Design an enzyme around this catalytic site. Sequence first.
Site, PDB file in Angstrom:
ATOM      1  N   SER A  31      11.575  24.084  37.839  1.00 32.26           N
ATOM      2  CA  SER A  31      10.675  25.013  37.151  1.00 32.26           C
ATOM      3  C   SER A  31      10.116  26.058  38.171  1.00 32.26           C
ATOM      4  CB  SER A  31       9.494  24.202  36.551  1.00 32.26           C
ATOM      5  OG  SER A  31       8.872  24.841  35.441  1.00 32.26           O
ATOM      6  N   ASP A  66      17.088  25.815  27.533  1.00 30.59           N
ATOM      7  CA  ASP A  66      15.825  25.609  28.243  1.00 30.59           C
ATOM      8  C   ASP A  66      15.218  26.976  28.292  1.00 30.59           C
ATOM      9  OD1 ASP A  66      13.603  25.425  30.093  1.00 30.59           O
ATOM     10  OD2 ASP A  66      14.751  24.740  31.794  1.00 30.59           O
ATOM     11  N   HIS A  73      13.773  21.772  29.038  1.00 33.64           N
ATOM     12  CA  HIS A  73      13.309  22.036  30.368  1.00 33.64           C
ATOM     13  C   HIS A  73      12.958  20.745  31.105  1.00 33.64           C
ATOM     14  CE1 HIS A  73      11.579  24.398  33.643  1.00 33.64           C
ATOM     15  NE2 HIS A  73      10.360  23.808  33.469  1.00 33.64           N
TER      16      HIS A  73
END
Lengths: 269, 269
Positions: free
Chosen positions: B146, B201, B258
């Site tokens: 991330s 994602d 994600h």
Amino acid sequence: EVSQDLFNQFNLFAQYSAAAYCGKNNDAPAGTNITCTGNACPEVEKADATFLYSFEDSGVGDVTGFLALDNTNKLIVLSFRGSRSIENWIGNLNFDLKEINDICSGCRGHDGFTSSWRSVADTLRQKVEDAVREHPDYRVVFTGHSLGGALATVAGADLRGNGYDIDVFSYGAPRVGNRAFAEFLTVQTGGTLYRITHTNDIVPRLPPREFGYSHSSPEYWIKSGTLVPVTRNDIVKIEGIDATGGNNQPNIPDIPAHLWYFGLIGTCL
Amino acid sequence: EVSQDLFNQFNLFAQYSAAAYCGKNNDAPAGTNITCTGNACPEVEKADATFLYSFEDSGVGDVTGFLALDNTNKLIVLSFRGSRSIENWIGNLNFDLKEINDICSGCRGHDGFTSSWRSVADTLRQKVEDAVREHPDYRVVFTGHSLGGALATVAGADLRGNGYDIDVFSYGAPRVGNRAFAEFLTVQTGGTLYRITHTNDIVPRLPPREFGYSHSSPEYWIKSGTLVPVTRNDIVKIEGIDATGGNNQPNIPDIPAHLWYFGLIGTCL
Ligand SMILES: *[C@@H]1O[C@H](CO)[C@@H](O)[C@H](O)[C@H]1NC(C)=O
Ligand SMILES: *[C@@H]1O[C@H](CO)[C@@H](O)[C@H](O)[C@H]1NC(C)=O
């Protein structure tokens, strides 16, 4: 090593239990398709399955869950949510017994479980019986994970022997009462209890035996690890009230093993 | 399809990245073994891997993470954690570009990521240098999920050309700047960047191209679903800056995707 078929049932009811948490239930129209976020319940989505009745925070124990109709597998499913914050829930778990002879004589159940059920029993029996009537051929199944699995085991014991079989599939459930009650759950006809455990799951270990609790038999214990996919050969049938050698073993329990029964459960991505 | 070797590497740094959230390392003394809660990083526990230096809310970016020595795989690994609440981080995310000529020429990168790195750059550069000295034989790898992916990508681009290769494995990283940066990171020497995305994602889809951002090439796109295990056959290499038909499709994006890169990541059971 359970059969492929029983494995498939195990997996489907793990997902109906996960749907108790990750559905977009709240209260959405009766007759809505059941779907979960985060790939929580793909086998249920695949099925022609719909809500019959949702409840959120019903009665005394703010009971949460849904009643579903599944025309693909020919089920009426009553699935109860566990807690919204399992760790707090566990931390605050009370160990008090209260009598429940009106289920079985000599029976003491966890006071809060039984009181939460009691307080919604009527509405829910009515909702089930309704559904039983419109689909007399369908199999009634109660399911849940954690406090959900508890509720489903009580309701099932309370609600059996009124004409229709009630199967119970429970995923990492706490003990639900005293040894008399254990025994009754292990023999009661008109429905099989499939009590499912994972590795060192902390939840099936509370309340402890020490406070006067037993576990019904048999016990289906998943031995594959957290976040590891389960195959038929990772499941082990365990006979004997309070048998040790599945979840009930003398090691450190784990909260994460609680959240992985066939896939992610008790929490929502 | 990618090679098995490459797949092993992708899986291993997905876990080093996952460890940035679920390791027990807050003030873990340098030298501690690396371990994770919830089976988040088993391939890492399996190696002789220990901390070199842990950091937490460091500098202007509140950047968190660790530097690790891995004797089994002969690595020096700098792992940046993503945000503690990714959903918030996502909706709070501005699209502001800053000039970053002191990394490449005409390169525009995201303001917050670039700044956050910038304010911790010297301390960390020192600590990587030390270990490269102490273990000249060992591969230096920067990794993150991330946010942590964006950081790692920025540090790598920033600290390469200084006499040791730096490889970068990012997992669901956002876009980091402008077509010129996308080009810089496509072609730069002294390293490979392995930019890994998953299905639909959402984070690799932010900031939007419509705010001037581009993606470095290539992209390793994981096709397999959320909570589904990954095989070398479920990864597709997608060639071309802002190629489409990997993660970069105009379908509707998803947050759970994600949180599943080879295994659970960005959250801790
Ligand atoms: C719900 O799924 C059923 C099949 O299981 C389908 O026929 C129905 O159209 C779906 N409804 C919606 C609104 O997607
Ligand atoms: C740390 O890891 C090493 C090698 O991988 C191991 O042999 C050592 O015993 C571990 N330390 C602890 C406290 O487990």
